[PDB]
């Protein structure tokens, strides 16, 4: 496999013509711009380096990578010296030895000898380059130092005390060499210039412009840490616990980017998690959540033994597996005989692997005898899988994340990648700072707009709901003018439909000059943006929940694909229509069924040819009718004819709308099993409980947004004794199915056998190749990094006439304001995993981003308590005045349960997939003191229900 993975080369990889040279008498062939250091690395001949890292561009600060080159004068650096043909370089002479020793002498003259009781012992790039070069003596009787607390005549002014304000890493500048990798990383890699170099010379100290890191613009992500060689910036878990020995590759249980990590391990104790320099998803970068937040797996509040109640009012009872499963299966069979098999159901968890997903949908189809399964994707990116299906042929992405590197423009509708998908936003900013352009269509100023060194930017700050009107107007502009690509239309799409679409869109009613009234966006700006999008060579669209979660989501997605096909930004690296999937293995989940209308492979359920295959493979009779969806489940159970539910890894209460309704529907249910780690809000209405396992204890795969199948490994051991697939088969066999699995490799084999695309998938492949894109059959064996590269899947694109339907959640006197729900970087959706960490620092309370002018007349001030008097409920929350949002718009966050936010949220949903209207809700923000009438009862219930016996 590549060397980039295991070895830290010096400089980044360059593209160009081959170039031959002789490093220390060894022939090497490498691209042109490639340095001497990287080449020498590729050739095995190692050169002493401290300030050079691949993540970033090289800088001649250490001066320790000096080499003698024929045809040059002196001892130039390899970090900065690009190769040239016929170049002959010498790496180790007496001269160079002397100089390097001298340089290290100078370094160490200002370094403490706290090795042997420093955190980074065994992992300091200074120590090992001080032993390499051959340092044996320091001759400078130093007086001016940075580490010495006590100088002569008194305290050292140069001494800067430690800074442990951050709960995850610490800054001890006493040990700082000024290589500046920290800076270079926060500025090149991440893209938030939080670090600088205060001073000129010896007085130069790294610093964030603030008393402490926390107060700064530094969020986290330990890039600064991953790059610091000298324990100045160090993880605390390495201070407390020792320095690790082994490494194990896994993936993050978040964000759907698939940021691959390598967990460093000292025995069985997890010391830290550090990115791998693998995965096209993350090239050695991360966020705070993945890098640091893995402490939920060791929280006291985690549950390790099954529990049964037999009545929700009654307390729990810690119980073993057998009798629990017995009780479970008994009640299940009872209900199955009484109300029918359609009176059951499951709820898969994206957070889980695809293997467990497959098992669960089997359990729901093969065993229970129904099609009533579902997952989190009904509410995140279902409309997507309808629109892109009606247009292209796939309910999935179009490109990788490496494509953005090649784009020349980014159009972002309904997304906040800095909080949602950080590692993607980094790569986006890398391109923005390199000239590319940006259009943003949110009503809420996102931090992607205020990125540093940004190029050009347009911002369409519209009114939420009006997202299709804007697209239609864009298309109207493009068609009124003549900017679109005709070749593309004639070739890859149809013409009969293009004519109709053009004649539809060309209407002056869908023009920017009219929509400006209802939309709120200006006209000229829109025209400009459209021209800019249509003009660019390679443009790319990245959309999220601003389009989907609405009364017109499928419609919008369709409109978007229409634009993308019209302009010609499809079937090429640098362009596409990329939806930003959220949870891990949402894609995997949807691919492995987890929908009540399909089988694994997005194959409908009414297809006899497929039902036959599966009846044969599972040896059971299946149903041809499609099952219920979550809202349907709840309405049913309220009405009856639904009595059972097996909730895997999901919080249907806090993470679903019309909380009152869902609660009332969850209560009227003779049995609702739970299969989470902790005692969630869902378990307040439960009868049963089964522990699950974390991604650290599991083994399997995760299918991310770019269709990549990352592999998940086992580092710890299941505290509850059994992972989730184990539990699933336990339950199924206990019911009477009779499966026998000993390793999920067998399951992946089953899948490869049943569904197409995964036919070539094998764990060994994932281990060797590193990762795979799931369309991997005998055709496209390596994988399919880009979809629709040669003609569309259905064969021909399809143009569809979209129109703007006025939403039913319009505003009035008593509900004048609007509402929006969204996200934060530190905390995940409900924070069951995250509130149980030290990330309650950046965000420990949910807050309401209200506008000032919309607050003055109300009497709001920052830090005041307010109430959201909506139609579907009422809630109390702390306020925050900000010009981020537009007037007549409000923004909330649902990460905390102490605040009940989805109770405000209304039942209104998409037309196709019934994804709810989260991003729109008519509310009334007013001032108040008494918290609420609902929150009180909720807490009462939760307290009277989370008690054990």
């Amino acid at each position: 496999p590549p060397l980039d993975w295991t070895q830290d080369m010096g400089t980044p990889k360059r593209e160009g013509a081959p170039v031959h040279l002789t490093i220390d008498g060894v022939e090497v062939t490498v691209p042109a711009g490639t340095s001497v250091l990287r080449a020498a690395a590729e050739a095995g001949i190692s050169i002493p380096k401290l300030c050079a890292t691949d993540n970033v561009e090289p800088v001649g600060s250490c001066r320790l990578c000096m080499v003698e080159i024929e045809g040059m004068r002196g001892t130039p650096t390899s970090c900065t010296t690009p190769v040239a043909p016929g170049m002959r370089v010498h790496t180790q002479t007496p001269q160079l030895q002397k100089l390097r020793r001298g340089v290290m002498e100078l370094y160490i003259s200002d370094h403490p000898l706290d090795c042997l009781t420093c955190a980074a012992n065994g992992d300091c790039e200074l120590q090992d380059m001080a032993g390499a070069v051959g340092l044996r003596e320091v001759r400078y009787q130093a007086k001016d130092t940075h580490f010495a607390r006590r100088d002569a005549t008194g305290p050292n002014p140069r001494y800067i005390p430690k800074d442990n304000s951050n709960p995850y890493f610490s800054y001890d500048p006493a040990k700082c060499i000024v290589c500046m990798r920290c800076v270079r990383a926060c500025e090149e890699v991440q893209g938030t210039f939080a670090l600088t170099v205060m001073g000129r010379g010896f007085d130069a100290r790294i610093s964030p412009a603030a008393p402490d890191f926390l107060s700064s613009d530094c969020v986290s992500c330990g890039a600064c840490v991953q790059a610091c060689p000298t324990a100045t910036l160090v993880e605390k878990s390495v201070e407390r616990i020792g320095t690790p020995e082994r490494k194990v590759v896994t993936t993050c249980a978040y964000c759907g980017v698939g940021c691959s990590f390598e967990a460093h391990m000292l025995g069985d104790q997890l010391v830290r998690m550090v990115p791998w320099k693998g995965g096209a998803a993350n090239r050695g970068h991360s966020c705070v959540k993945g890098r640091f937040a893995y402490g939920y797996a060791t929280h006291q509040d985690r549950i390790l033994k099954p529990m049964i109640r037999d009545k929700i009012t009654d307390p729990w009872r810690e119980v073993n597996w057998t009798e629990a499963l017995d009780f479970t299966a008994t009640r299940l069979r009872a209900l199955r005989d009484s109300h029918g098999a359609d009176a059951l159901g499951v709820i898969t968890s994206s957070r889980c692997t695809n293997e467990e997903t497959y098992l669960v949908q089997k359990l729901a189809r093969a065993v229970f005898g129904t099609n009533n399964t579902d997952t989190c994707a009904r509410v995140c990116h279902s409309p997507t899988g309808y629109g892109l299906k009606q247009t292209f042929g796939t309910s999935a992405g179009t490109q990788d994340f490496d494509s953005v590197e090649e784009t020349d423009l980014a159009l972002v509708i309904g997304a906040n990648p800095t909080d949602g998908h950080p590692v993607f936003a980094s790569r986006l900013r890398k391109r923005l700072r390199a000239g590319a352009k940006l259009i943003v269509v949110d009503p809420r100023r996102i931090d992607l707009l205020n990125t540093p060194h940004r190029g050009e930017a347009w911002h369409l700050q519209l009114k939420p709901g009006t997202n299709v009107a804007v697209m239609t107007a864009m298309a109207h502009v493009i068609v009124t003018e003549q900017i679109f690509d005709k070749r593309f239309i004639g070739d890859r799409c149809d013409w009969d439909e293009w004519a109709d679409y053009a004649e539809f869109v060309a209407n002056p009613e869908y023009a920017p000059e009219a929509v400006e009234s209802l939309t709120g966006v200006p006209a000229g700006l829109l025209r400009q943006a459209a021209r800019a999008y249509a003009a660019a060579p390679n443009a790319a669209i990245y959309y999220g929940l601003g389009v989907t979660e609405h009364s017109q989501g499928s419609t919008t997605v369709i409109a978007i694909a229409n634009l993308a096909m019209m302009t010609g930004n499809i079937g090429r690296p640098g362009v596409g229509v990329n939806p930003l999937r959220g949870q891990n293995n949402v894609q995997g989940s949807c691919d492995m069924g987890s929908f009540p209308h399909e089988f694994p492979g997005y194959r409908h359920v009414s297809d006899d040819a497929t039902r036959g295959l599966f009846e044969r493979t599972w040896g059971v009779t299946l149903s041809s009718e499609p099952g219920l969806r979550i809202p349907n489940m709840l309405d049913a159970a309220v009405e009856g004819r639904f009595k059972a539910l097996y909730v895997q890894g999901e919080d249907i209460l806090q993470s679903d709308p019309d909380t009152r309704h869902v609660s009332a529907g969850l209560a009227a249910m003779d049995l609702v099993i739970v299969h989470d780690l902790f005692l969630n809000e869902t378990a307040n209405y439960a009868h049963v409980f089964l522990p699950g396992s974390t991604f650290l204890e599991k083994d399997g795969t995760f299918t991310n947004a770019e269709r990549r199948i990352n592999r998940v490994r086992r580092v710890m051991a299941p505290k509850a004794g059994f992972a989730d697939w184990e539990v699933t088969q336990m339950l199924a066999n206990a019911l009477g199915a009779g499966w026998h699995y000993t390793h999920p490799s067998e399951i992946m084999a089953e899948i490869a056998a049943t569904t197409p695309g995964f036919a070539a998938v094998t764990y060994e492949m994932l281990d060797a190749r590193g990762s795979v894109q799931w369309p991997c059959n005998e055709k496209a064996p390596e994988g399919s990094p880009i979809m629709h590269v040669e003609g569309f899947v259905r064969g021909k694109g399809r143009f569809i006439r979209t129109a703007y339907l006025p939403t039913d959640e319009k505003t009035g006197p008593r509900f004048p304001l609007l509402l929006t729900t969204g996200r934060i970087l530190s905390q995940y959706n409900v924070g069951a995993q995250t509130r149980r960490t030290e990330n309650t620092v950046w965000h420990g309370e949910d807050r309401l981003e209200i506008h000032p002018t919309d607050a003055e007349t109300r009497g709001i001030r920052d830090g005041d308590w307010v109430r959201l008097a909506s139609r579907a409920g009422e809630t109390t929350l702390r306020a925050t005045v900000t010009d981020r949002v537009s007037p007549g718009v409000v923004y909330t966050t649902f990460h905390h349960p102490d605040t009940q936010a989805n109770v405000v949220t209304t039942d209104t949903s998409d037309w196709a997939t019934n994804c709810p209207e989260y991003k729109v809700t008519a509310v009334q923000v007013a001032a108040s003191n008494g918290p609420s009438d609902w929150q009180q009862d909720y807490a009462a219930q939760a307290a009277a229900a989370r008690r054990i016996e």
Binding site: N372, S606, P626, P631, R801, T802, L805, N914
Partner: protein, 69 residues
Amino acid sequence: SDDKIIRMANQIAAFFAVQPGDRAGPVAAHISENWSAPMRAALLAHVAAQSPGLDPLVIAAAPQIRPVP
């Protein structure tokens, strides 16, 4: 006091109305590919009972819906 089912039907109709060509076939196809047995039955009962607050397109599309066992 609108039925969620009627609401969803009218939504689907509102969409497929602007489409070109067969505007009912697709409606029926969607409702047959996506909805379940009891729901379809309820809908058909509504259309047969001629309940108000319902689009004529759905009335036209109902007979074409996948039948219920």
